[PDB]
Amino acid sequence: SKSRKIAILGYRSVGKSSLTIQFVEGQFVDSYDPTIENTFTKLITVNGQEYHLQLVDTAGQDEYSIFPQTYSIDINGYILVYSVTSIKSFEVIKVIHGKLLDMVGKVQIPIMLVGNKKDLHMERVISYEEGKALAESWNAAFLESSAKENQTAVDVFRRIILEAEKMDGA
Amino acid sequence: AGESYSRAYGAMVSCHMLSELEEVIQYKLVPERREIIRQIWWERLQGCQRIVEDWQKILMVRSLVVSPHEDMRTWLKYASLCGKSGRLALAHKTLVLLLGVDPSRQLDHPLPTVHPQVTYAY
Amino acid sequence: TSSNVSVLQQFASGLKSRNEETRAKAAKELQHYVTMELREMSQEESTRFYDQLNHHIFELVSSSDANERKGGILAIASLIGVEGGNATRIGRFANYLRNLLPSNDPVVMEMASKAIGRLAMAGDTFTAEYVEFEVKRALEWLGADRNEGRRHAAVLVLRELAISVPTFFFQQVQPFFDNIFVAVWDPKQAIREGAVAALRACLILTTQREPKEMQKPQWYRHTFEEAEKGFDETLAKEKGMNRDDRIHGALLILNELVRISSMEGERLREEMEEITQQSTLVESRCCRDLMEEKFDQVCQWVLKCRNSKNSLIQMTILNLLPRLAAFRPSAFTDTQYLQDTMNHVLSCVKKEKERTAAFQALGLLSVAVRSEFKVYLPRVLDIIRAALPPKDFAMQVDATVFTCISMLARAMGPGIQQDIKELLEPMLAVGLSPALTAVLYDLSRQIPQLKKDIQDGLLKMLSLVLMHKPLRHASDVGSITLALRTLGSFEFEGHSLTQFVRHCADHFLNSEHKEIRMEAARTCSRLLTPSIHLISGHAHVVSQTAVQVVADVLSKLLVVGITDPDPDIRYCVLASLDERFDAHLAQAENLQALFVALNDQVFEIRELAICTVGRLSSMNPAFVMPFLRKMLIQILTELEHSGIGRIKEQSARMLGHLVSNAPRLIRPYMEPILKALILKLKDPDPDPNPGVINNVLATIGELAQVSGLEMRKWVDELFIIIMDMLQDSSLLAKRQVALWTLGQLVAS
Amino acid sequence: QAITFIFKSLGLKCVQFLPQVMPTFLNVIRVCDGAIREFLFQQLGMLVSFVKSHIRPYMDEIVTLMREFWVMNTSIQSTIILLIEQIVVALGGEFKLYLPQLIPHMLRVFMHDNSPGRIVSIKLLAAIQLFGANLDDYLHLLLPPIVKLFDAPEAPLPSRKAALETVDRLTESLDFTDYASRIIHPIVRTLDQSPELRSTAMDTLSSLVFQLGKKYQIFIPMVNKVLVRHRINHQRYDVLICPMKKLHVSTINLQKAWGAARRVSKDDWLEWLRRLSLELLKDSSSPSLRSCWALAQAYNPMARDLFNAAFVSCWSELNEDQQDE
Ligand SMILES: O=P(O)(O)O[C@H]1[C@H](OP(=O)(O)O)[C@@H](OP(=O)(O)O)[C@H](OP(=O)(O)O)[C@@H](OP(=O)(O)O)[C@H]1OP(=O)(O)O
Numbered sequence A: 001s002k003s004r005k006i007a008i009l010g011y012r013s014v015g016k017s018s019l020t021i022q023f024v025e026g027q028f029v030d031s032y033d034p035t036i037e038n039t040f041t042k043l044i045t046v047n048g049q050e051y052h053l054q055l056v057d058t059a060g061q062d063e064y065s066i067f068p069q070t071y072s073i074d075i076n077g078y079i080l081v082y083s084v085t086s087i088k089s090f091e092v093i094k095v096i097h098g099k100l101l102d103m104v105g106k107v108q109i110p111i112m113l114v115g116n117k118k119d120l121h122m123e124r125v126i127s128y129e130e131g132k133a134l135a136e137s138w139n140a141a142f143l144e145s146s147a148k149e150n151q152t153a154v155d156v157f158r159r160i161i162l163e164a165e166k167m168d169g170a
Numbered sequence B: 001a002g003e004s005y006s007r008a009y010g011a012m013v014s015c016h017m018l019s020e021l022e023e024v025i026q027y028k029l030v031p032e033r034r035e036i037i038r039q040i041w042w043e044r045l046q047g048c049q050r051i052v053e054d055w056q057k058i059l060m061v062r063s064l065v066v067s068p069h070e071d072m073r074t075w076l077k078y079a080s081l082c083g084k085s086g087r088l089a090l091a092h093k094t095l096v097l098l099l100g101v102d103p104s105r106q107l108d109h110p111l112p113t114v115h116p117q118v119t120y121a122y
Numbered sequence C: 001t002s003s004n005v006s007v008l009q010q011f012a013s014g015l016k017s018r019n020e021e022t023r024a025k026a027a028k029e030l031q032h033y034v035t036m037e038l039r040e041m042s043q044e045e046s047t048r049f050y051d052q053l054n055h056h057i058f059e060l061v062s063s064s065d066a067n068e069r070k071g072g073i074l075a076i077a078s079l080i081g082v083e084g085g086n087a088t089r090i091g092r093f094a095n096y097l098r099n100l101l102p103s104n105d106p107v108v109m110e111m112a113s114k115a116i117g118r119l120a121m122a123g124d125t126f127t128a129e130y131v132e133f134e135v136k137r138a139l140e141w142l143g144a145d146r147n148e149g150r151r152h153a154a155v156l157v158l159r160e161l162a163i164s165v166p167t168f169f170f171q172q173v174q175p176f177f178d179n180i181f182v183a184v185w186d187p188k189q190a191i192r193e194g195a196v197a198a199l200r201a202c203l204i205l206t207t208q209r210e211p212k213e214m215q216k217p218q219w220y221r222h223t224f225e226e227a228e229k230g231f232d233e234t235l236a237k238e239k240g241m242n243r244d245d246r247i248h249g250a251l252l253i254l255n256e257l258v259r260i261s262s263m264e265g266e267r268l269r270e271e272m273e274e275i276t277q278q279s280t281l282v283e284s285r286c287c288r289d290l291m292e293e294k295f296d297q298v299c300q301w302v303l304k305c306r307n308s309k310n311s312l313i314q315m316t317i318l319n320l321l322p323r324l325a326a327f328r329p330s331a332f333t334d335t336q337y338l339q340d341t342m343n344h345v346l347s348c349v350k351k352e353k354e355r356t357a358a359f360q361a362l363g364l365l366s367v368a369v370r371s372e373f374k375v376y377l378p379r380v381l382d383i384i385r386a387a388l389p390p391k392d393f394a395m396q397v398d399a400t401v402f403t404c405i406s407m408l409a410r411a412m413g414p415g416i417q418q419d420i421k422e423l424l425e426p427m428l429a430v431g432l433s434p435a436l437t438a439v440l441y442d443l444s445r446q447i448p449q450l451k452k453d454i455q456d457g458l459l460k461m462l463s464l465v466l467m468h469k470p471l472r473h474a475s476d477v478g479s480i481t482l483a484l485r486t487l488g489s490f491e492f493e494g495h496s497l498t499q500f501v502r503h504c505a506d507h508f509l510n511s512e513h514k515e516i517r518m519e520a521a522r523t524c525s526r527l528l529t530p531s532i533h534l535i536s537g538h539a540h541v542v543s544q545t546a547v548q549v550v551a552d553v554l555s556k557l558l559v560v561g562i563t564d565p566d567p568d569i570r571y572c573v574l575a576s577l578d579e580r581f582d583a584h585l586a587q588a589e590n591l592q593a594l595f596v597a598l599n600d601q602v603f604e605i606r607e608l609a610i611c612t613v614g615r616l617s618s619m620n621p622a623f624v625m626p627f628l629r630k631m632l633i634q635i636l637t638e639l640e641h642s643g644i645g646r647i648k649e650q651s652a653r654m655l656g657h658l659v660s661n662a663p664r665l666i667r668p669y670m671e672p673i674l675k676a677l678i679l680k681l682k683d684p685d686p687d688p689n690p691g692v693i694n695n696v697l698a699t700i701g702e703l704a705q706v707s708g709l710e711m712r713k714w715v716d717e718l719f720i721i722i723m724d725m726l727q728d729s730s731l732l733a734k735r736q737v738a739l740w741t742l743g744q745l746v747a748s
Numbered sequence D: 001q002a003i004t005f006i007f008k009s010l011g012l013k014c015v016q017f018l019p020q021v022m023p024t025f026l027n028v029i030r031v032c033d034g035a036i037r038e039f040l041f042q043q044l045g046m047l048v049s050f051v052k053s054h055i056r057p058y059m060d061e062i063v064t065l066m067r068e069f070w071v072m073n074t075s076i077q078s079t080i081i082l083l084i085e086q087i088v089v090a091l092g093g094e095f096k097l098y099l100p101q102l103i104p105h106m107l108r109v110f111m112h113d114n115s116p117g118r119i120v121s122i123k124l125l126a127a128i129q130l131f132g133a134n135l136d137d138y139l140h141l142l143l144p145p146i147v148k149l150f151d152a153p154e155a156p157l158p159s160r161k162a163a164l165e166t167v168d169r170l171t172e173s174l175d176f177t178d179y180a181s182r183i184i185h186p187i188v189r190t191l192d193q194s195p196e197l198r199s200t201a202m203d204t205l206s207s208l209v210f211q212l213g214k215k216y217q218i219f220i221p222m223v224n225k226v227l228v229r230h231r232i233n234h235q236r237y238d239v240l241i242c243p244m245k246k247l248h249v250s251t252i253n254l255q256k257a258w259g260a261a262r263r264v265s266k267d268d269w270l271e272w273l274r275r276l277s278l279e280l281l282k283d284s285s286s287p288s289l290r291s292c293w294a295l296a297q298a299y300n301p302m303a304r305d306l307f308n309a310a311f312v313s314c315w316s317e318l319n320e321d322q323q324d325e
């Protein structure tokens, strides 16, 4: 068996809470208005091996919100989320990632960028290429998701567990 | 000490006796400091609460190097306190000790005038 | 600020050097800088400083070079525990350390584990959760099926967390035991030894809280069960596994259990370790019950695996059997396991690798069975005589053997004196060794009849070694240092010692080797103690020749403590001065020498010099009093006019030592001194460091000590000042000094 | 940060807590550290956004500090401008009174920062779009700075746009009747320089003409001549020609925190108390307590102070059987 933790970070009012809740239960609503700190548990099977994730929904940080330290010690996995329907959220995810790498030290850590709300094809303002390029600058994995395409959401979490799993060894 | 000072006075008395015992150490060490330590003893005692038991503890601590006749005022005030508390026997025996003689045994003779203040207290 | 960054760059460059000494010195310099020079700045600026230091930690850890990463690890180790463990510190340091643990170098892994342990002791609020991850991560690696390096690293980090941060590890104890034993059975020697060490640490953790647990812990029984499972014949049939490894693990586990149940045996082993080298020990009640329940099973297992010829198995058996003896001498004496125990010990004594610890075990066994061992003395003695050089003949002997003799004397001593008398001159034929001196010291402390011969033989040895001449009724630096140290320390009698000092007064105080000078000074100062006591105390036993020798030695010692530039020699020489010396230090020339020494560049030498002269002031006020006045004048001058806080605190420190050691001079100058100190306290701006105010407060208290009756007038102003300082919560201001001052003031 | 979260929770009811929270806050932003001060200014802006109507009695005091603290620094400038945006959203009815005190800072920002604060000036320009009723009076002072801003090539073209759509937006609410004819010539002058500017300049000119139609007819020939020289048309030209919910308690973690089965020593029990209080704050249903959790973790006495309230929330949130457990 194994245990892991994951912290989801990004601008407020983006896929963080919705994506987490879709993963853990499998339902999306407009409740759970702007959160403060939420914790959820889920067992997962990756590469034919068990993982126990304690997912953490974080309060959305703005461009000037100081980086909380509860997430800079024990998380060993970071989901960087930005809504594809807000360029400001995409700048904010840059700056929060920057503050994280500032505070977590140099250490190459499993980071993954997730552009959620891809189902809003009629309102997107960030392209797949933009996020892919930004992640490649970070050298982190990239994905798109929606709070109703639950399968992809599962993959998202799987990917981070894969992301640490491949990269923990080397 | 977390709740109130009134209950913490039962430990303030301990602090008092420890510090005064260090003062006994100093009194033994330095003859010239003896008078000033005696005066400090009197002052701090006057600054203490008027409790017979705690007074007895402090005075026993002070008695290690000082006989009663060297601090007649302190034992006179102690006897006065014992009289106030109703412990007439303790005050009477302390007065006899300070006098050196017991007028109860000498009812047919006047009081020993040699220590008039102690006679007044008796 | 640019100066700070440049100094950081110098530290980074120095720590990048592969030289271990250079890295250590750079780390210590950074430690000093952060401890003193960083505290002069605010806390947000301190956070920025930690950010810069973490950039320099990057710079040290940027390369994959083992030396560079070791230097970075030393950096992180140095920073932690010095200042408050701010959040950024703990976060960045933990993240950096997690990158290092699976390293291939065992040295880097050990350093990283110790760093993780001290980071846990950092005490920041996140600590309680931090370790809960690392332990877990470590435990996960124990569950891993491969990657010996990962298992090793997990084992060491678990050990360090258990040892250094017990409270937060005690909760994780329950999952710990599940995986620790699968870590123990790993074929790798190092992983097994480290894992049983972690088991040690956690078992002491369990013991520390077991008495208050109203319900017995199952951990000891579970560990015994895994031990026997290691000894299982059927379970040993698991292929892809060497039976010797499982037996070694089982023995190690039983050693753990015995030690935590046989704390007396650990005390004996600790005594031996202290003797050879030149902590708290607890015992578990429930483990004691378990061991006495199944002790014979342990003995049967140990004797069954005795026949194994693996060197490490033999080592463990020799390290374990004396533990059983200390645990239960009676079983060995009665059931006759003692016969095979002695036979095996003497049989493995003839192979070096296990012989070394076999001698330790022989001493332990001799103590444990303090009576029956007599029967085996004829054997042991001869073989130890064989270990020691015979009279005819590199003749370098292992230290451990000597230790055994000492311990062998602690139980059979009075019975074996008649052969110790023969065994003296062989060790004297071995040559100098710190173990030799220690064992001779212990034998002296045991039986005086042996003490006399020990003293005489050691005098002859020192006559041959240091003096190059026989006793009457190039040379290695370390050997001479040891010789002089033992000469000074251990007790002796006779006229010959006088000669020793005189030669050492002329040939070794001026020796070109620094350590030799320092040790010669210290030893001569020690050696003149009984002669000076006889001269001063026993005025009727005074020998003018001894007085002349004392004066000559002191004069040359002071010349050495004034001439040579290096600081340590002067510091040790001056500290060697004692009240015994004072009667002969008051002369004009010696007093002038001390006067000159007081004006030396180093600071602590000035402190000790002012203390010494103040102490001397009693007997000959004529020479010292005007010079004390002059030093007071200059101290006041610098305190008033020196713009560097360092100079001000130095001045205050000299004044404090002056008043402590020279009160009578200070009574007439009571007023101006206190006026100056009050003005110092009333200065609106503080110096760069708070040491100035601390020295001021200590000086105030030391002044009050003698001057209280007069100072009664001035008490109120300095009292309100002290009240203001205390009521300022943000000022540490060496608060013990402030309260010390307040107490002394009120008392005086 | 916790205070901001609580206000977000109590947006309707937070007014009652103004007199205690607000005053001393000002003091700290007066004496705290630079970066901390900028974060505090941003959080004060959020407070304004949640206190919108009721910060008037404190409004004056606030502007004093920012009048003192609007140094020509890029980061401080951006934060203060955002705070201006949130004020003008809040005090919309009354902000006219405090507008002139802040006018000179904005003038100096336009005039001096020929540096990447020009980008910051764009943010300032965004704020300008919201002062409508308040700025109806001081438009005469404020506009000509904007005029030189979008008429000067030296300023970066995005700044020129920002200014030009800023005047376009201000066309919708203010009075341009009398003077604004003159500022057409800058706009017309801008039409001679860059196509990207020319498009949105045509848009802004159309908006202004709509406002100025009657007045614009009198002096159209010069501008329409220049326009037809540039060969663009618009329809208006011809037209003129003719609160928070209760967070759900995770009973599992609540019981786990209370599980002191293996706490023995004094250190163990104190640690258990610490972890208990922190878990109670984390798992509390009341959003304000869970907000306080972070400071509690960074500050143990904070955890101790609200142990009772957090436990009360959790206990009220439990089932009878779970209550008995
Ligand atoms: O003669 P003392 O033992 O010193 O006591 C008495 C009196 O106490 P009595 O009720 O026992 O006579 C007063 O009360 P205490 O202080 O002794 O409790 C005392 O003090 P006060 O006048 O302040 O009450 C007063 O005078 P002094 O303070 O100098 O001791 C003193 O003499 P009197 O008998 O004349 O009152």
Ligand SMILES: Nc1nc2c(ncn2[C@@H]2O[C@H](COP(=O)(O)OP(=O)(O)OP(O)(O)=S)[C@@H](O)[C@H]2O)c(=O)[nH]1
Residues within 6 Å of the ligand: A011, A012, A013, A014, A015, A016, A017, A018, A019, A029, A030, A031, A032, A033, A034, A035, A036, A058, A059, A060, A116, A117, A118, A119, A120, A145, A146, A147, A148
């Ligand atoms: N259509 C659509 N709405 C979404 C999607 N993701 C989130 N939302 C909606 O947007 C709003 C905000 O998104 P949400 O996921 O709740 O933000 P958040 O991360 O919880 O916000 P905070 O709690 O972190 S401050 C919610 O009302 C939610 O219903 C999505 O993929 N598609």
Ligand SMILES: [Mg+2]
Residues within 6 Å of the ligand: A016, A017, A033, A034, A035, A036, A057, A058, A059, A060
């Ligand atoms: Mg949320």
